[PDB]
Scaffold this active site. Structure first.
Site, mmCIF file in Angstrom:
data_model
loop_
_atom_site.group_PDB
_atom_site.id
_atom_site.type_symbol
_atom_site.label_atom_id
_atom_site.label_comp_id
_atom_site.label_asym_id
_atom_site.label_seq_id
_atom_site.Cartn_x
_atom_site.Cartn_y
_atom_site.Cartn_z
ATOM 1 N N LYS H 159 0.823 -1.206 0.000
ATOM 2 C CA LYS H 159 0.000 0.000 0.000
ATOM 3 C C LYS H 159 0.859 1.259 0.000
ATOM 4 O O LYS H 159 0.576 2.208 -0.742
ATOM 5 N N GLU H 185 -2.124 8.216 13.758
ATOM 6 C CA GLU H 185 -0.949 7.480 13.315
ATOM 7 C C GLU H 185 0.111 7.512 14.406
ATOM 8 O O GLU H 185 0.354 8.560 15.011
ATOM 9 N N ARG H 186 0.742 6.365 14.648
ATOM 10 C CA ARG H 186 1.726 6.258 15.712
ATOM 11 C C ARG H 186 2.972 7.073 15.377
ATOM 12 O O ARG H 186 3.246 7.400 14.219
#
Lengths: 50, 150, 93, 464, 149, 48, 516, 348, 50
Positions: H159, H185-186
């Site tokens: 992806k 998002e981390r």
């Protein structure tokens, strides 16, 4: 029918400037009696003649 | 301030969570029976902190930092507040390290390295405890190595 | 025929320009007139006189009635009791 | 004595009164609207007291256009409705004022709509059997005179059609005085019913009054009480048997729920009224055939959301004797008289009342359908190849007997363009016994679809 | 929180440490109970909306550092218990979506046969070969497809 | 004021410089106002 | 400069006719703000449900009342509200301007033009809620309303003054159906006869602007806007429009209908309106009910709905037909809103994503979708030519379940299976293909008589098309004959079957095999 | 002028203002921390009008150490974000302050975050076909110009590499610049993504915006608005075709539910916002192309508990044009796109 | 007394379920549509018996 659409297209491109030509004279002549209109406005606002 | 470590005449402690125009709520941590109407509270110190040192190895202490075990008192090095900001995005690298687990299945299917958060999820009577304790005790060779790199 | 309606639309735009010009001139010039010609003090009272005329020519209006009902009754009773009891009060009493 | 409006919200109104006079419960109150376009006078009924001479009340007209401080006047009486001999032959509203002929009335007797149930000493059980041309109703759940009739089902399962079918059958067979009423019915069907009733030349003895959707709920739960009062007035003084027809009582219950939500009382299960069973029993026990007064009534009930877990029809289940239920799957199969035989039952069916042959026939049919349903789960995937022939014959017989119950009533004359049919009970039981003998196994199944009788059965079968 | 602070102190100076959490469901229950008894509104499953945030401020501590600050490291190993093989519950879904890599442990496999009883068709590692020994990865020869088939 | 309302009406004057003329009275909630600015605004907004 | 002179004269006349005076009106003071909720005081002269003219040009209604400051609801820009501000109330109860120039225009629910084409004028203002016609002043349905789609009219008829409901899943083409009906209405609009003339009103609620532009352009390409009134409530707007627009549609229909005009109303969606009502009711702290839905929703949708009905002959006998559209999730009739809508109305049509998936575009179920409208809807020709179709389709659907076993049929229902297949292949319809009653009754007669059995399934469609156009190219006397007497004369039957035989003998199949 | 705080609980704050200094909706206010070890600055937004010169507000940072009576100032406008040509050169969060260095200041022109969708008359009446460099994508599922597309996949299915491919393809083929807005998002993944873009030599023309977990929901819900403001400015000013990337949508819904329960409203629709439709429409009305310039975006949604019937998925599917699916066996077959033609469809 | 029989002018009987600081709740056994504010309530000094 596409050529008829094109024909109507130049009719539009002529009308859009004929209206501008008329609007030129409208702009020139708008100021003929606006002072009297404003005087009537002031008179009716004050409740007495201006 | 929020999360203040308060004081009570009976010796117990407490923490303030919710405020108001005219009232202060709190949560009692230890014993609760001695609490009664008419007592007086004293604002002491600041937000609670923990004294961290290096003598904590091989002992069992309180969640608040008291030697609940039968061993003598523990020493202290510095006090750290519980609430601190997380490390930023400009202070991290890529992860690449063979962090061993001692189990054929875990490292045969799912490799584990330093800095990676792996979750174990299981049903009742499964074997999470044995797996974790064996992983913990597998570091005997690493500990026996002289340098602290391993 | 559609092009005829856009002709009418352009005439509408001309009327819009007419509206904008009329509004601008009316606002500015009427404001100058009112703030310049009739700003003299001697005229102001005259306006009031005209206003006074309006006040004298309006038809009469009917006006009445100038919070618990039990509280209202108790307050009315207390007022009545004071009115019955404060008769003997003196200047210093 | 004057009343002043202090606070209003929704259809509910709160009013304040002087200490001197306070009317009791269930009394008429008059107020007006001073607005031009929406000029109208309104009437309120006493609901409850709130202390400090504060009274809560309910409207049956829309409350838009009100203003505070309007004077409120009382009549010192409950709601009175007209009663008389010439009542029949006219349409009526919630108020009881005539709709077809404005101003008609105000010269007959007046009775309240709040009455009390009869004493227990005058109660009497009944077993008078009633027969109908439809075969399925007579074979499974024979009708009993002087009792209560329940028509259960979901939405759009042909309740209305069978309603006019039965009413036509009764009107043609039996005369006397009759009363039709209901809540939750459309205008179009009402006009069609009026037209058909005029066609039948029996509207002269029929009483007509009913509500609509676009109305405040007060009318919704009061028109039924008015209809019951008419029924009791006709039953008591005249001493003649009266037919009663009531449709879609479910809306009634729903109506109550709405007003309870406005009152502010604590909600109940599924957000229903704090008390519904007591009012349900009061409504039901108002209907009772006396020793000298034979009264027959039928009830159409709507099941919400095609779920029977709702206590709304569960409460009514305890007040009924003869019940006929409908299901969506039977309708989807194709047969219009989608009446479930498995679920349907009646309390009149007993060998003491009816001969043993009918009892045996009913038991055999019930067992056959039960076995068919039991095997349906296995046949649903695998089929008859795995199954034995001893059960294959049972499957065939069950399919044929199920398809045979289909019938062509005359009410479908406006849809199918074919006349109806009627069969006496003796022929019905004889044909059903013959079918259960299994002689008709040779005949094709499709021939049993929408057939009149065994003669027509043979004619149709041999025609193909 | 105290355990995390103690681990972070040693981590920040370059001491490699590892952190294990015995159980987190009880922490969630205690937080829910104290929140309700503090007279705060309830949510879905009578749970405060911020409970997720709580775990967000708890499990995120452990990570790898750069060589600027000494290159320390610390690892967290949370433990989650499940009943009747239900995964769609609030806390399990939240904690799964908040982390990377999971290890499903099946009871039927433990009933007979395999003692580790670790699933193969469910477990996944995000790091993968980045946390692999070269000899191990080469000798492995991708037996996963072989076991799947 | 005593003509329109039977009760006598007290007078309390507050000076406003914003108005270019006219006069405003408030006997409670009913309000009477004749203002140059108000009438100018009314005429302007109803121009189209 | 004739236009300039006229404009100057009109401006002079207007400005010289300006008038204003002073009155003892009442002005309130704003004391509350937030969440579109404000409280005002200083208005003893209250009158329930009066409107407001805010200084910023926005409007509202003071619905809620109490002993203290009442709580109104504001529509528009609610951020200009401040404590201590003032508001003027007008006693003009809510009403919509009405005029015959509204057709071919799209305006907001409050009536202000939005197309930007210019301005509009009205003559009166009917209120949004009034008394409905009674039972004694109605009449039965005896007028056939023609529809473009052959399938719907052949299966479940539609009549003027009768409500029909469409229930479906997402992405099935209800928009296509309503557009086809509107386009079909163009021929009816063509005649100048008022009795046969029908007006159409469309309402879109919670619809994306792209969809609005697409449908508007489709309408313009159709060139049938001479009888269309369009009302739009885009999704990005507030819930007030989403809760009030259908009432505006109801009022605009009622005005012309008290004037004696045939009317149809089409509603894009109602579920979003129910959602908006639920949200605004919850903002009021009103106790909730099942699925948090207040119980008033049934009354709400009813009071919207039964306003559509046919009047009695004496009053004018007007008739409007209502078409609401409902979208259901996971094809379940067991849902609260679908339950209420099916209960309240009579007759419905079912669309399912299955048949649309296997390929046939018109996906109409034949076992559950029914209508109670009687036989007066069909013409007698349609009644005689069409019969037993529903039962045949039902038994075809039952028997196709055992197609895997030919050892049971054994040349006993082969004809039934083939006829069912040919009929199923016949019912499909292409996109944007208006069709008249004449050719469609021809097609249904041909399908019933089974004269296309020899024709292979792979081209039957195009077959009839050729046949159809040939009959258009050939003599059209039979069409006029069955159009006048409204029945199939026998002599036309022999003539048409002879023409059919002549055409099919001259026809070749797709593979080149002539039919015998 | 200055405001004095009244009561505090969690992140909710209450302030009092003078009679003639009451702010309107959505203002900006500043606070400071006296404690040296916890020295910090607080940004505050106005969301409610409780009356009596008392306002309830939500802070954009965690609340700690606050003392009553702290003077409260007013910025006098909405949240201001900087824009200019120097954007897309580095990374920063919704606050506009660059994380890598505080070198970037206010030289960029400052705009308000709140905007409105375009008018109705000027909307484009016709659609346009969008062509790409992938054979299977263009053959199977056509992409509408300026539309919204959903993508399903996991890790190891390419992806990210596909995202890089399409970014550089649009950069070199039709010009323009794209932006990325990572929501939920981390931190380590964001750092890895920044390093990957730096090594991909395509970091110059990309503007990265990020949101962290520890932050309160206000930032998590205003990050998307900031990103769309950035994109709208770029489109309207440079005339460049732009691409919008969104991580997930359910995280935004969870943040909205959290702020709803935080304010203390009446949860509805299985504990959801009763006005979720209005907020989603406000977000999604500003994507459609107009004036000849297209603003395309794709979003990835995470189905909860293997359910398509949840109201949030149902509502977010209401503005979808194309759906794409990536599988694992298709990659095991040894193909680059790893897309199944059988599980994808489009609306054009 | 708690759960004690109470008599009312209408001939109906009631039982005290819950007792508050200044208010006493009662339930009516039979007819309750003739009950109005200001009536007279009298205790029988005896708990319910049959």
């Amino acid at each position: 029918r596409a050529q008829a659409s094109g024909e109507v297209a130049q009719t539009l491109t002529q009308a859009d400037q004929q209206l501008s030509a008329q609007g030129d004279q409208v702009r020139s002549g708008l100021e003929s009696s606006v002072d009297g209109l404003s005087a009537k406005l002031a008179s009716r606002i004050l409740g007495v003649d201006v | 301030m929020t999360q203040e470590l308060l004081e009570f005449p009976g010796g117990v402690l407490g923490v303030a969570l919710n405020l108001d125009e005219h009232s202060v709520g709190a949560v009692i941590l230890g014993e609760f029976e001695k609490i009664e109407e008419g007592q007086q509270v004293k604002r002491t110190g600041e937000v609670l902190s923990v004294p961290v040192g290096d003598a904590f190895l091989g002992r069992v202490v309180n969640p608040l930092g008291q030697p609940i075990d039968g061993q003598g008192d523990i020493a202290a090095e510095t006090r750290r507040a519980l609430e601190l900001q997380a490390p930023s995005v400009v202070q991290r690298q890529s992860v690449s390290e063979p962090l061993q687990t001692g189990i054929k299945a875990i490292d045969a299917m799912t490799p584990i390295g330093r800095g990676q958060r792996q979750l174990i999820i299981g049903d009742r009577k499964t074997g999470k405890t044995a797996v974790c304790v064996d992983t913990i005790l597998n570091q005997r060779e690493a500990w026996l190595t002289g340098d602290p790199k391993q | 025929a559609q092009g005829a309606q856009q002709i009418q639309l352009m005439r509408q735009q001309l009327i819009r320009q007419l509206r904008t010009g009329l509004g601008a001139e009316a606002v500015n010039k009427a404001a100058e007139i009112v703030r310049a010609h009739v700003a003299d003090p001697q005229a102001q009272s005259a306006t009031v006189d005209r206003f006074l005329s309006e006040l004298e020519q309006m038809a009469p209006s009917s006006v009445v009635i100038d919070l618990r009902a039990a509280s209202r009754q108790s307050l009315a009773a207390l007022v009545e009791k004071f009115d019955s009891v404060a008769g003997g009060l003196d200047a210093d009493g | 004595t004057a009343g002043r409006v202090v606070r209003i919200t929704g259809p509910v109104v709160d009013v304040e009164f002087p200490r001197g006079s306070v009317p009791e419960l269930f009394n008429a109150l008059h107020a007006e609207i001073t607005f031009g376009a929406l000029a109208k006078t309104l009437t309120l009924e006493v609901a409850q007291h709130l202390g400090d001479s504060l009274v809560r009340c309910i409207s049956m007209q829309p409350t838009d256009g009100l203003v505070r401080g309007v004077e409120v006047t009382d009549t010192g009486a409950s709601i009175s409705v007209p009663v008389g001999d010439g009542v029949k032959g006219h349409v009526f509203n919630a108020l009881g004022d005539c709709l077809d002929d404005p101003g008609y009335g105000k010269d007959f007797e007046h009775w309240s709509i709040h009455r009390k149930p009869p004493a227990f000493s005058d109660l009497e059980p009944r077993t008078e059997m009633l027969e109908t041309g439809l075969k399925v109703v007579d074979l499974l759940t024979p009708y009993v005179r002087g009792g209560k009739i329940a028509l259960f089902g979901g939405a759009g399962v042909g309740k209305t059609v069978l309603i006019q079918e039965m009413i036509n059958r009764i009107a043609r067979n039996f005369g006397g005085t009759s009363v039709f009423a209901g809540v939750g019915e459309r205008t179009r069907e009402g006009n069609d019913l009026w037209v058909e009733l005029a066609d039948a030349n029996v509207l002269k003895d029929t009483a007509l009054v009913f509500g609509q959707m676009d109305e405040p709920p007060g009318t919704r739960m009061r028109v039924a009480l008015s209809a019951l009062t008419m029924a009791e007035f006709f039953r008591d003084e005249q001493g003649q048997d009266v037919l009663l027809f009531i449709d879609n009582i479910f809306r009634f219950t729903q109506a109550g729920s709405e007003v309870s939500t406005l009152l502010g009382r604590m909600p109940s299960a599924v957000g229903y009224q704090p008390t519904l069973a007591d009012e349900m029993g009061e409504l039901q026990e108002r209907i009772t055939s006396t020793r000298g007064r034979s009264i027959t009534s039928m009830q159409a009930v709507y099941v919400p959301a095609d779920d029977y877990t709702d206590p709304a029809p569960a409460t009514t289940f305890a007040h009924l004797d003869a019940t006929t239920e409908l299901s969506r799957a039977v309708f989807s199969k194709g047969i219009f008289p989608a009446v479930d035989p498995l679920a349907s039952s009646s309390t009149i069916l007993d060998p003491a009342i009816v001969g043993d042959e009918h009892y045996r026939v009913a038991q055999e049919v019930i067992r056959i359908l039960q076995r068919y349903k039991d095997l349906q789960d296995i046949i649903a995937i695998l089929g008859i190849d795995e199954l034995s022939e001893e059960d294959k014959q049972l499957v065939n017989r069950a399919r044929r007997i199920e398809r045979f119950l289909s019938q062509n009533m005359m009410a479908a004359e406006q849809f199918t363009g074919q006349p109806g049919s009627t069969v006496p009970l003796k022929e019905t039981i004889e044909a059903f016994d013959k079918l259960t003998k299994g002689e008709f196994d040779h005949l094709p199944e499709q021939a049993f679809f929408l057939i009149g009788g065994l003669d027509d059965l043979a004619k149709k079968a041999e025609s193909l | 929180y105290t355990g995390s602070a103690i681990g972070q102190h040693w981590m920040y100076n370059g001491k490699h440490v590892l952190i294990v959490f015995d159980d987190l469901s009880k922490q969630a229950d205690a937080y829910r109970a104290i929140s309700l008894l503090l007279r705060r509104p309830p949510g879905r499953e009578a749970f405060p909306g911020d409970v997720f945030y709580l775990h967000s401020r708890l499990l995120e501590r452990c990570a790898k550092l750069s060589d600027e600050l000494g290159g320390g490291s610390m690892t967290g190993l949370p433990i989650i218990e499940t009943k009747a093989n239900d995964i769609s519950a609030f806390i399990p879904t939240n904690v799964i979506s908040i982390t990377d890599g999971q290890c499903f442990l099946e009871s039927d496999l433990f009933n007979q046969g395999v003692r580790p009883a670790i699933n193969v068709g469910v477990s996944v590692s995000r790091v993968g070969g980045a946390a692999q020994i070269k000899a191990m990865k080469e000798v492995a020869g991708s037996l996963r497809l072989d076991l799947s088939q | 004021l005593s003509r329109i309302y039977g009760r006598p009406v007290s007078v309390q004057l507050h000076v406003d410089p914003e108005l270019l003329g006219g006069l405003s009275i408030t006997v409670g909630d009913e309000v009477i106002d004749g203002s140059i600015a108000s009438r100018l605004a009314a005429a302007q907004t109803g121009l189209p | 400069t004739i236009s300039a002179a006229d404009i100057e004269g009109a401006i002079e006349d207007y400005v010289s006719s300006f008038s204003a005076d002073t009155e003892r009106e009442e002005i309130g003071t704003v004391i509350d703000a937030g969440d579109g909720i404000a409280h005002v005081e200083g208005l003893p002269s209250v009158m329930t449900q009066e409107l407001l003219e805010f200084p910023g040009g926005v409007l509202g209604v003071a619905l809620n009342l109490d002993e203290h400051s009442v709580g109104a609801v504001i529509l528009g820009e609610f951020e200009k509200i401040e404590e201590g501000q003032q508001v003027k109330r007008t006693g003009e109860v809510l009403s919509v301007p009405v005029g015959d120039a509204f057709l071919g225009r799209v305006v907001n629910p409050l009536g202000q033009p939005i197309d930007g084409q210019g301005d509009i004028a009205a003559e009166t203002r009917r209120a949004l809620e009034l008394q409905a016609p009674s039972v004694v002043q109605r009449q039965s349905v005896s007028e056939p309303l023609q529809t473009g789609i052959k399938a719907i009219d052949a299966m479940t008829p539609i009549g003027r003054g009768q409500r029909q409901l469409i229930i479906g899943d997402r992405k099935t083409g209800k928009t296509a159906v309503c557009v086809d009906t509107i386009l079909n209405q163009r021929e009816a609009w063509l005649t100048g006869d008022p009795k046969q003339q029908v007006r159409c009103v469309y309402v879109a609620i919670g619809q994306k602007g792209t969809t609005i532009a697409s449908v508007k352009r489709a309408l313009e390409e159709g060139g049938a806007m001479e009888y269309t009134t369009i009302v739009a409530a885009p999704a990005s707007d507030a819930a007030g429009f989403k809760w009030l627009a259908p009432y505006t549609g109801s009022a605009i229909g009622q005005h012309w209908m008290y004037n004696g005009k045939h009317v149809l109303i089409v509603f894009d969606d109602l579920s979003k309106q129910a959602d908006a009502y639920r949200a605004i009711s919850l903002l009021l702290r009103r106790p909730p009910g099942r699925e948090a839905f207040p119980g008033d929703v049934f009354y709400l949708h009813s009071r919207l709905l039964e306003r559509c009905a046919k009047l009695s002959d004496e009053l004018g006998g007007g008739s409007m037909t209502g078409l609401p559209i409902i979208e259901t999730k996971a094809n379940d009739i067991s849902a609260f809103i679908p339950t209420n809508v099916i209960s309240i109305t009579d007759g419905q049509c079912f669309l399912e994503s299955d048949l649309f998936n296997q390929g046939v575009r018109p996906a109409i179920n034949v076992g559950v979708s029914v209508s109670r409208v009687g036989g007066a809807a069909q013409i007698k020709a349609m009644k005689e030519v069409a019969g037993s179709l529903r039962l045949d389709l039902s038994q075809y659907r039952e028997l196709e379940a055992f197609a895997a076993f030919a050892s049971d049929l054994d040349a006993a229902s082969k004809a039934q299976l083939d006829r069912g297949a040919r009929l199923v292949e016949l019912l499909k319809q292409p996109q944007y293909s208006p069709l008249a009653v004449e050719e469609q009754v021809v097609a249904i007669f041909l399908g019933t008589q089974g004269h296309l059995d020899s024709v292979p399934v792979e081209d039957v469609q195009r077959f009839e098309s050729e046949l159809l156009e040939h009959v258009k190219a050939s003599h059209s006397d039979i069409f006029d004959g069955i159009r006048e007497t409204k029945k199939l004369s026998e002599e036309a039957e022999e003539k048409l079957v002879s023409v059919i035989n002549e055409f099919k003998k001259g026809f070749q199949a797709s593979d080149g095999s002539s039919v015998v």
